[PDB]
């Protein structure tokens, strides 16, 4: 029916998506060789959203891997569920950006994104009625930020009346891998404010604290973080793949959650998330799900909403549940903590239910809250960017490649008006 193509950029995007296709294929019962082995008819009836039957029970994922280094692509086909992707979908450069956003947006982008667009165009016309596009990338890298950024801009010029998601991890001062993170973040977000339909703000700090306290893991490699992110992404699209009492497509959530067109950066959470010592001691009820859902520490972004107010919030529930519990729980969590919600919008929480849980659990949830606390992140990177730019450090790879001085001044100005308009609407 409605179809979503998948686009993974850079190293972070590629590895996030690899675990994503593994988890999804397990939900629909496709083995790593790409054949159907499920039992229920509910699994076979909605695999056209993410796959195409090739020949004789061969279901291939509708995904496009794109980056600038061969190591990532080889690491995809090596691991399991690596043999399911069509090899033509490996659009692929060779030289590399080197964490230089200009090289990802002006130097190397000019020779790859045309090739990327051919594969993307083929995957859009391969399906009938597009629901939207799904892009997983970072904001601190070069080949994920710049390459994915220019791709997003060109795509919105081609298919403008279609939805678009960008799952993006953002950098933070405590988890600081690259040195030019602020230059990449502020310019990348400057493009996201005018191109993306809605963006989902992620960051690595929150992922580390989820695996520290909630999951109580000892050695949380990147496989577990990608495992966490994949559960959230599968949750946002369960409504398209399984029937339920209250369905909510991507368009339904965006039109309902975004009160003003430029304010489309979200904070995400997921429930339930429990450690192996406490997976036995818990119950599975809607209120138990709700408090662990709205918890401050359980946000999958390191921006505490309790420093500000909620504008809108959304809940996507999965499993056999009673809709009265759904509605009364949203009403109670809004009445006790009444100051944390915006005032000139009553009933700031939209909720929906789907009748198919993730495999291995009786009942789960997914939270999408559009709060006003996100301006902290924009200031936290803006001051670092201004601190660097007022002495032109690290600028010659930017100005020597094609940027001028006015682009950084444009970035600050757009940065400053967005944090100012967040401040007004709060």
């Amino acid at each position: 029916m409605r179809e979503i193509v998948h686009i993974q950029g850079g190293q972070c995007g590629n590895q996030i998506g690899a675990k994503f296709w593994e988890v999804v294929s397990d939900e629909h019962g496709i083995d790593p060789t790409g054949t159907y082995h499920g039992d229920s008819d509910l699994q076979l009836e909605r695999i056209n959203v993410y796959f195409n039957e090739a020949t004789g029970g061969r279901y291939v994922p509708r995904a496009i891997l794109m980056d600038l280094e061969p190591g990532t692509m080889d690491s995809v086909r090596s691991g399991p569920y690596g043999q399911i992707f069509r090899p033509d979908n490996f659009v692929f450069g060779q030289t590399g950006a080197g964490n230089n956003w200009a090289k990802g947006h002006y130097t190397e982008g000019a020779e790859l994104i045309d090739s990327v667009l051919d594969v993307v165009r083929k995957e859009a016309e391969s399906c009938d009625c597009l629901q939207g596009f799904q892009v997983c990338h970072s904001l601190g890298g070069g080949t994920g930020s710049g390459m994915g950024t220019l791709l997003i801009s060109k795509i919105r010029e081609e298919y403008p009346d279609r939805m678009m998601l960008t799952f993006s991890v953002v950098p933070s001062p405590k988890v600081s891998d690259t040195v030019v993170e602020p230059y990449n973040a502020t310019l990348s977000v400057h493009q996201l404010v005018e191109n993306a339909d809605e963006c989902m703000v992620l960051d690595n700090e929150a992922l580390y604290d989820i695996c520290f306290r909630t999951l109580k893991l000892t050695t949380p490699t990147f496989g577990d973080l990608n495992h966490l992110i994949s559960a959230v992404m599968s949750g946002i699209t369960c409504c398209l793949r399984f029937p339920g009492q209250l369905n909510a497509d991507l368009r339904k959530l965006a039109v309902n959650l975004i009160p003003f067109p430029r304010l489309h950066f979200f904070m995400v959470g997921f429930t339930p998330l429990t450690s192996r010592g406490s997976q036995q001691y818990r119950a599975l009820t809607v209120p138990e799900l709700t408090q662990q859902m709205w918890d401050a520490k359980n946000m999958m972004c390191a921006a505490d909403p309790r420093h500000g107010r909620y504008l809108t919030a959304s809940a996507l529930f999965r499993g056999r549940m009673s809709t009265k519990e759904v509605d009364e729980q949203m009403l109670n969590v809004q009445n006790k903590n009444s100051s944390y919600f915006v005032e000139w919008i009553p009933n700031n929480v939209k909720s929906s239910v789907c009748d198919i849980p993730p495999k291995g659990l009786k009942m789960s949830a997914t939270f999408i809250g559009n709060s006003t606390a996100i301006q902290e992140m924009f200031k936290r990177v803006s001051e670092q960017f201004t601190a660097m730019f007022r002495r032109k450090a690290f600028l010659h790879w930017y100005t020597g490649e094609g940027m001028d001085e006015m682009e950084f001044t444009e970035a600050e100005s757009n940065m400053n008006d967005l944090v100012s308009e967040y401040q007004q609407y709060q």
């Binding site: 080889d74 060779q94 590399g96 080197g98 405590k174 891998d177 690259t178 040195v179 490699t221 450090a393």
Partner: protein, 427 residues
């Protein structure tokens, strides 16, 4: 992706003898050149099962080259690669740059061209030289001049040996270092300093070797290079390339001088009684008791740092460890840079070579940082170079070769100008 490594001078090709030794012992190749795909960055395959390194040894004196022609690796190196002159520059920068250099560097160039042509995705070059001599200084700078005009956009990793402050073997080396830096400044993209007294102190204290020769020095240098190319050779949880250091570590096109260090340099006995984890090696990479250049970053301020991690290392603790470093106050970063780190983790541990004095360690860290303590060393060189230049000692040899008094004064004021440049960025 490929990178070729060129070696100039007595110290240069001796360093190569340890590097290619380490390489074949890591990729399981016998010294004759046959296995009993990741080797593609350094070795090209004949197609008959023989692997040949991407390297050219060249110098002006045939002594150090011809023991290599008859060691164990007689059959590993292609004969044309091992270039050799007929007579030495003899610790005379001008003699290596104008008299004898002008005949030998053109042969090296039309050789290095077909090494690059055999390559496909050339990442860059990386050069090895000691500035105290005449070959590594003179034709080294001449070779870098002609390399910049040929390629330009390709990285040129200069792993240079600067003369030690107090421990020195030659007497005209202050002249050679100043004139060489004058061109190493505007040609090398990323130039790493490797002193000799610092490596001497590491082998004395850490390796507890009280009688070290040049063999152990070259051994640990190869270890740092191996730790730096593992990200290019092998896959890790978080990798970087050689084009990453060009952007992430040098804020201005003339400030490219990095302090290197490595950890843990530990003997065979401490490892048995001691514990290895990520936090303590993240600490040990920063203390000045493990640096490779006699300077103190405690006197300077950091611009940006880089961290190679090898072995069984997860990414959660490298972040936690670098966080603990920033919250400490013994070392401080420049005001303009809020974030000053570039981290990287790779899966393969460092292999060991039999006969070396490096233990088999479970994990290791290779740190490459940039600071302003490097400004103190350059100033320290200027005092004793200017000390003798005014009275015109030893000038008659260089000017007799065909130079004049002009290039001393103009090279002197250029590096003097660099002193002022370092002081103004630190403020």
């Amino acid at each position: 992706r490929e990178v070729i490594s060129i070696h100039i001078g007595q110290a240069g090709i001796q360093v190569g003898n340890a590097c290619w030794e380490l390489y074949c012992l890591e990729h399981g190749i016998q010294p004759d050149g046959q296995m009993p795909d990741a080797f593609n960055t350094f070795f090209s395959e004949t197609g008959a099962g023989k692997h040949v390194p991407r390297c050219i040894f060249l110098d002006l004196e045939p002594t150090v080259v011809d023991e290599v022609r008859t060691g164990t690796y007689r059959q590993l190196f292609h004969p044309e690669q091992l270039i050799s002159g007929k007579e030495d520059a003899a610790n005379n920068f001008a003699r290596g740059h104008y008299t004898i250099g002008k005949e030998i560097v053109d042969l090296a160039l039309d050789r290095i061209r077909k090494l690059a042509d055999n390559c496909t995705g050339l990442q860059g070059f990386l050069v090895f030289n000691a500035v105290g001599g005449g070959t590594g200084s003179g034709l080294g700078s001449l070779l870098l001049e002609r390399l910049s005009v040929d390629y330009g956009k390709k990285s040129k990793l200069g792993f240079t040996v600067y003369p030690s402050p107090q421990v020195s073997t030659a007497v005209v080396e202050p002249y050679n270092s100043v004139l060489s830096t004058h061109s190493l400044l505007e040609h090398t993209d990323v130039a790493v300093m490797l002193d000799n007294e610092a490596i001497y102190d590491i082998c004395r204290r850490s390796l507890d070797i009280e009688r070290p020769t040049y063999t152990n020095l070259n051994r640990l240098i190869a270890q740092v290079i191996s730790s730096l190319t593992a990200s290019l050779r092998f896959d890790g949880a978080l990798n970087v390339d050689i084009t990453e250091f060009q952007t992430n570590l040098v804020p201005y096109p003339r400030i490219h001088f990095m302090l290197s260090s490595y950890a843990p340099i530990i003997s065979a006995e401490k490892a048995y009684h001691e514990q290895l984890s990520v936090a303590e090696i993240t600490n040990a990479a920063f203390e000045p008791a493990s640096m490779m250049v006699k300077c103190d970053p405690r006197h300077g301020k950091y611009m940006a740092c880089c961290l190679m991690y090898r072995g069984d290392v997860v990414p959660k603790d490298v972040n936690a460890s670098v966080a603990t470093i920033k919250t400490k106050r013994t070392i401080q970063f420049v005001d303009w840079c809020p974030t000053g780190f570039k981290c990287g983790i790779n899966y393969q541990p460092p292999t060991v070579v039999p006969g070396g004095d490096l233990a088999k360690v479970q994990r290791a860290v290779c740190m490459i940082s940039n600071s302003t303590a490097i400004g103190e060393i350059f100033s320290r060189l200027d005092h004793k170079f200017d000390l003798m230049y005014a009275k015109r000692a030893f000038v008659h040899w260089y000017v007799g070769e065909g130079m004049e008094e002009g290039e001393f004064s103009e090279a002197r004021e250029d590096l003097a100008a660099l002193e002022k440049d370092f002081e103004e960025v630190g403020a």
